[PDB]
Amino acid sequence: FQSMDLPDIVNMYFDADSCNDTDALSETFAPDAVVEDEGARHQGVVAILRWWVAAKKAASYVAEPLESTVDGDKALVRAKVSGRFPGSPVTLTYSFTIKDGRIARLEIQ
Amino acid sequence: FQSMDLPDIVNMYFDADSCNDTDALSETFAPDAVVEDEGARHQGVVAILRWWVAAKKAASYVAEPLESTVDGDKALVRAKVSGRFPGSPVTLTYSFTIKDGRIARLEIQ
């Protein structure tokens, strides 16, 4: 696996996540976007930013993409998640839906 | 290949390089450290910072570690370098020498 395997926009998500870059992260999602993570659903870019800020304070995590497959408007990324949280590190699937050069949806499972 | 395959300190180098993080980068090298790159030698943390800043302006590059092997105090990392420069992208070997949880030397070839 290699970065270049990812759609530019998914790559921008992880760079921003990894560099704690709020601006870049905010510009990554559609205005109407949804994130489902940790038993919950966050709709709209405001809720998504709230969600991303809390998860950083809660665990100071690193998400590292390990492999990927792109199927249509969907991109599926396995990522090693590592940090201050019970059971660390754990491997997760990030399923991204891309509408119009932005992220419309992201399910973390 | 995976981040955890790298010594913590080598990983700090690439995270900082990647996030344009000058503080973190400066604290990565020994005071007496040397970087050899692009036909030239930079000694001391001041020269190293100068070198890192000019290269970022020159090419806005991304260095992405692809694989690694550790042998003794030495760590050898193949990295895909990508950017605004002739012949991009190119694969390079970063040879790091580690003395006391810092980098004493880095040769890029």
Total number of residues shown for chain B: 109
Q: For residue A106, count other CB atoms closer than 10 A to its CB.
A: 23
Size of interface A-B (CB pairs under 8 A): 23
**Resolution of the experimentally solved model in angstroms:** 2.3
Solved using? X-ray
Q: Is A93 in contact with A76 (CB distance < 8 Å)?
A: yes
| Chain A residues close to B15, C-beta within 8 Å | 18
| CA-based nearest residue to B47, from B32, B63, B57 | B32
Which of B62, B67, B81, B91 is best to mutate for the A interface (most A CBs within 10 A)?
B62
Question: Can you tell me the distance from the alpha carbon of B90 to that of B20, in angstroms, rounded to the nearest whole number?
Answer: 20
Q: Rounded to the nearest 10 degrees, how much is the dihedral formed by the CA atoms of B6, B9, B11, B14? A: -140
Q: How far is A53 from chain B (nearest CA, A)?
A: 18
Cα-based distances in Å from B77 to A51, A56, B64, B92, B102: 35, 29, 10, 8, 16
Strands in B3-88 per DSSP E: 29-37, 40-43, 62-71, 74-82
Pairing of strands A40-43, A29-37: antiparallel
Q: Is B10 in contact with B77 (CB distance < 8 Å)?
A: yes
Q: A100: left (phi > 0), else alpha (psi -120 to 50), else beta?
A: left
Q: Is B34 in contact with B43 (CB distance < 8 Å)?
A: yes
- Domains belonging to chain B, first-starting first, are 1-109 (3.10.450.50)
Question: Can you tell me the distance from the alpha carbon of B101 to that of A97, in angstroms, rounded to the nearest whole number?
Answer: 42
* Side-by-side strand order, sheet with B40-43: B40-43, B29-37, B102-108, B90-99, B74-82, B62-71
Q: Which residues contact A2 (CB under 8 A, 6 or more apart)?
A: B64, B66, B80
| Distance, CA of A18 to chain centre | 10
DSSP letter at B38 equals: T
DSSP labels for A34-90?
EEEETTEEEESHHHHHHHHHHHHHHH--EEEEEEEEEETTEEEEEEEEESSSTT-SE
- The string over A67-84, giving b where at least 16 C-beta atoms fall within 10 Å of a residue's C-beta and e elsewhere, is ebeeeeeebebebbbbee
For residue A106, what are its two tokens? 């992201």
Q: Which residues contact B33 (CB under 8 A, 6 or more apart)?
A: B43, B44, B45, B48, B102, B103, B104, B105, B106
Q: Which residues contact A65 (CB under 8 A, 6 or more apart)?
A: A1, A3, A6, A14, A77, A78, A79
**Which is it for the CA torsion B24, B29, B34, B38, positive or negative?**
negative
B2, B15, B80 member nearest A80 (Cβ): B2
Reported as type and span, the H/E element at residue B90 is strand B90-99
| Chain B residues close to A4, C-beta within 8 Å | 80, 82
Pairing of strands B29-37, B40-43: antiparallel
Question: Can you tell me the distance from the alpha carbon of A76 to that of A78, in angstroms, rounded to the nearest whole number?
Answer: 7
| CA-based nearest residue to B92, from B47, B38, B55 | B38
